[PDB]
Design a protein around this ligand. Structure first.
Ligand code: SO3
Ligand code: CA
Length: 240
């Protein structure tokens, strides 16, 4: 997250860190959202490599013991059947991970609230991005979870030529684009939390930023629109 503020320890309890095994150690690569005690939602692109993955729930500082973490293996990866690694702009950047065991819920580990199917946010709706991703273009990961206020940009504006043009699809949410605040590498797969009827719900899965940099004026961060995939998510969980 570029231009964020440090998140409080108990603000975003559905956020997870998706990590891969790197020799003798584990490295954060993506975010995700805990959606059941044994299922995580993340970006398909985060799991294209055939690595060993684990999920950490209850994480705040990647590099220190917080006394709240639970570490769990990934038992099954279900990528959207239409995902194409070579065409991120086509969409379908969503995957579900079945965890090897159920996590324990507490004030640091809670399920994310999903929107109703088909829900579209008005322009300039209040949302926050969270993650441990780079804090500057071509910078370094955050140690502590960051948040940034990232209001939505509706499809008509986002798909206009001075924004993203035809690269964005109606199956995506755009947020931000002020040139100061954005997602960045290592935020991928994580949530966009948006306030609807008094409750934060997870409306986006972080998918991509510009090749020119993370925080680029009129190139909002782009998310998979979770409300486009409710039927798919429910079908996967019911059959696995
Ligand atoms: O997957 S990287 O683009 O955050
Ligand atoms: Ca920690």
């Amino acid at each position: 997250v570029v231009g964020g503020t440090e998140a409080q320890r108990n603000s975003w309890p559905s956020q997870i860190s998706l990590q891969y095994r790197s020799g003798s150690s584990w490295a954060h690569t993506c975010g995700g959202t805990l959606i059941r005690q044994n299922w995580v939602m993340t970006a398909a692109h985060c799991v294209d490599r055939e690595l060993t993955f684990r999920v950490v729930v209850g994480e705040h500082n990647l590099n220190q013991n917080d006394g709240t973490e639970q570490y769990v293996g990934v038992q099954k990866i279900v990528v959207h059947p239409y995902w194409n690694t070579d065409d991120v702009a086509a969409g379908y950047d969503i995957a579900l991970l079945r965890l090897a065991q159920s996590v324990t819920l507490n004030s640091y580990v809670q399920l994310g609230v999903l929107p109703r199917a088909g829900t579209i946010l008005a322009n300039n709706s209040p949302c926050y991005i969270t993650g441990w991703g780079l804090t500057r273009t071509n910078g370094q990961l955050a140690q502590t979870l960051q948040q940034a206020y990232l209001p939505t940009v509706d499809y008509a504006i986002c798909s206009s030529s001075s924004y993203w043009g035809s690269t964005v699809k109606n199956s995506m949410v755009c947020a931000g684009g002020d040139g100061v605040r954005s997602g960045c590498q290592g935020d991928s797969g994580g949530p966009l939390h948006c306030l609807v009827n008094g409750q934060y719900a997870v409306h986006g899965v972080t998918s991509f930023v510009s090749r020119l940099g993370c925080n680029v004026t009129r190139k909002p961060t782009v998310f998979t629109r979770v409300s486009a995939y409710i039927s798919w998510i429910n079908n996967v969980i019911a059959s696995n």
